[PDB]
Design a protein around this ligand. Structure first.
Ligand SMILES: *[C@@H]1O[C@H](CO)[C@@H](O[C@@H]2O[C@H](CO)[C@@H](O)[C@H](O)[C@H]2NC(C)=O)[C@H](O)[C@H]1NC(C)=O
Ligand SMILES: *[C@@H]1O[C@H](CO[C@@H]2O[C@@H](C)[C@@H](O)[C@@H](O)[C@@H]2O)[C@@H](O)[C@H](O)[C@H]1NC(C)=O
Ligand SMILES: CSCC[C@H]1NC[C@@H](O)[C@H](O)[C@H]1O
Length: 489
């Protein structure tokens, strides 16, 4: 219905300006007839998920590249796409006026937007908080009688999550991750730095930390929010590095294995939230497949682990080999973000290409879902209480009641909007060596989705063949991303 309002900030492409009364949006989707496809196009030149239609022809004539759908070659089923509701994200959204907040939330979660269905919720503070805190900072409270949610949850995070769920067509799955435990449970007595839990898996410390998970889930349940999954610890390897600046909690692979087997696994299974999935790792994929071997060879740990969470910050040696060793334990991208460059580059087409190329690689190596980091940030990449400023698909300018949708937002949306939960990745065979990145999936309803990323400068003429329908003649322009959709019957 409403097109993008472009604005350049000196980088390779434009942002889309939104405020309290205007934001670009989609109409409700349609079901075009057999023999007709839908194409959504975003380009560095300024096109933003523009919709067009064309025919799927019975015959083909030409000399160029051919991608052939192979719907019988079936792979993983998709859980979904989304981003993280951090303190920083919540503060930046709520700095807008209410009408602008809803255009922002609709941009992510509505069918007028790109249809997110995953929200990652940090358990207490991380670096994208304005202060250090946990849910139980009074010491010597091993039964956790003084566990409580601060204003960050009750005032900022939870109300925004409620509003996101109301705007969403598809069911939204919440995913929780802790950064640090209370400091009186740690070896170093600090929120950051090199430090693990006190003692050994099984004792009062590890039982208290595991109970902290149930107490967290109880609190959000009282606020009428249920979680799909929790991770065992955010980037547990970081808590083994000397003098680590952000909130952390150190686990070596065997410590995570024993903590899951003795404490976290049983405690979650004995609780009201026994259906909540447990994801391991939640860390860099270079720690794979080793981290999976350690944890998942132990059946007492493995019986509790539903999946392996990975961060994006070679895929065959990591994701592919881990799938070969443990093909029934799903892989899930739980966090991705973007030395000499500033933290926020308003309008960077490169960082958008980085997002879509990575999602394509993850999908081509069995990953069932991808989760962004901060849903929103200010123009300097904050607030962040340490330093680590990064980019975000939506950048909020408080002083002008305005937010900007980066190219990252649309590169994500080319996947998040058209691959609902339950979609299965299927085969897509290139007729010859080419420079494009492509992935094919099938909706639960049988229709086809194909995303085509062109990171090169040259236009690439392209034909997509569906054995059941025909030939889709198209062109992939240089520095562009397309999504194609068509009924198969
Ligand atoms: C919010 O964004 C809208 C969209 O750009 C602004 O509406 C535009 O206002 C300018 C005046 O400078 C007109 O020339 C355009 O025709 C308007 N665009 C429309 C109606 O689509 C609006 O001004 C912005 N809000 C504020 C407070 O500046
Ligand atoms: C698709 O077209 C095929 C080739 O067509 C033949 O070769 C070209 C070079 C022209 O000379 C054309 O006139 C010829 O008929 C056919 O063999 C095939 O049957 C066609 N199939 C469909 C479904 O249209
Ligand atoms: C992977 S290294 C740095 C840590 C990353 N994952 C944890 C978040 O708190 C950080 O902001 C993000 O950059």
């Amino acid at each position: 219905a409403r097109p993008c309002i472009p604005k350049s900030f000196g980088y390779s492409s434009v942002v889309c300006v939104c405020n309290a009364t205007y934001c670009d949006s989609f109409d409700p989707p349609t079901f075009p007839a057999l023999g007709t496809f839908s194409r959504y196009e975003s380009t560095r030149s300024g096109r933003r998920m523009e919709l067009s239609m064309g025919p799927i022809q019975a015959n083909h004539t030409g000399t160029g590249l051919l991608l052939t759908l192979q719907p019988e070659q079936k792979f993983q089923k998709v859980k979904g796409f989304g981003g993280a509701m951090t303190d920083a994200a919540a503060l930046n959204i709520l700095a807008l006026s209410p009408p602008a907040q809803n255009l922002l939330l609709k941009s992510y979660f509505s069918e007028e937007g790109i249809g997110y269905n995953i929200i990652r919720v940090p358990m207490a503070s991380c670096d994208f908080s304005i202060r250090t805190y946990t849910y139980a900072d009074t010491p010597d409270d091993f039964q956790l009688h003084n566990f409580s949610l601060p204003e960050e949850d009750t005032k900022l995070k939870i109300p925004l999550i409620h509003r996101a769920l109301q705007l969403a067509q598809r069911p939204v799955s919440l995913l929780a991750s802790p950064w640090t435990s209370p400091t009186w449970l740690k070896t170093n007595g600090a929120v950051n730095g090199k430090g693990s839990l006190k003692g050994q898996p099984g004792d009062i410390y590890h039982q208290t930390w595991a109970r902290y998970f149930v107490k967290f889930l109880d609190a959000y349940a009282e606020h009428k929010l249920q979680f799909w999954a929790v991770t065992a610890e955010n980037e547990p390897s970081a808590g083994l590095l000397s003098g680590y600046p952000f909130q952390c909690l150190g686990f070596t692979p065997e410590h995570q294995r024993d903590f899951i087997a003795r404490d976290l696994g049983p405690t979650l299974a004995n609780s009201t939230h026994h259906n909540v999935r447990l994801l391991m790792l939640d860390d860099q994929r270079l720690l794979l497949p080793h981290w999976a071997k350690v944890v998942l060879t132990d059946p007492e740990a493995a019986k509790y682990v539903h999946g392996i969470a990975v961060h994006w910050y070679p895929a065959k040696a990591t994701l592919g080999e881990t799938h070969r060793l443990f093909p029934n334990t799903m892989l899930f991208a739980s966090e991705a973000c973007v030395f000499w460059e500033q933290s926020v580059r308003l309008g960077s087409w490169d960082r958008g290409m980085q997002y879509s190329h990575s999602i394509i690689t993850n999908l081509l190596y069995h990953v069932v879902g991808w989760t962004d980091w901060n849903l929103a940030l200010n123009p300097e990449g904050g607030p962040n209480w340490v330093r680590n400023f990064v980019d975000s698909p939506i950048i909020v300018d408080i002083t002008k009641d305005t937010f900007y949708k980066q190219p990252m937002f649309y590169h994500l949306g080319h996947f998040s909007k058209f691959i609902p939960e339950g979609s299965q990745r299927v085969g897509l065979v290139a007729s010859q060596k080419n420079d494009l990145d492509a992935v094919a999936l099938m909706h639960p309803d049988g229709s086809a989705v194909v995303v085509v990323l062109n990171r090169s400068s040259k236009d690439v003429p392209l034909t997509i063949k569906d054995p059941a329908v025909g030939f889709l003649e198209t062109i992939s322009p240089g520095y562009s991303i397309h999504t194609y959709l068509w009924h198969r019957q």
